[PDB]
Amino acid sequence: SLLEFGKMILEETGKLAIPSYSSYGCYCGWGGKGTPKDATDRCCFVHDCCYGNLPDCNPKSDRYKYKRVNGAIVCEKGTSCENRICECDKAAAICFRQNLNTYSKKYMLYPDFLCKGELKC
């Protein structure tokens, strides 16, 4: 859920996912259309596609557990869903971290009306 994902984002980026990444570009939020604004936004686009490939799960709601071994996030075995959701979140949190050098404040509080056109996963 947003609880676990938010925790990873803070640990990896040092920034509170909300409000830092909850209104970023076209894909970091609830939106889901248009061309991603930058690398960070693409991380969210990819995260959405990952979640979109978990039809048999409830990404945003399902709770899962994870640990950190040797400074890295480790998704332990739970239900198939918990494991997959964890992996989607892990990949995105790290993606955010890897691209912090191009995180742009100008893309915060981005209005969805500027985002249109379905982009294929």
């Binding site: 947003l2 609880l3 994902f5 938010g6 925790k7 990873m8 984002i9 803070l10 509170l16 996912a17 909300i18 990444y21 909850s22 894909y27 970091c28 939020g29 609830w30 969210c44 995260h47 959405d48 979140d89 995105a92 949190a93």
Partner: peptide, 5 residues
């Protein structure tokens, strides 16, 4: 305990 999307 804090990410959307």
């Amino acid at each position: 305990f804090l990410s959307y999307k």
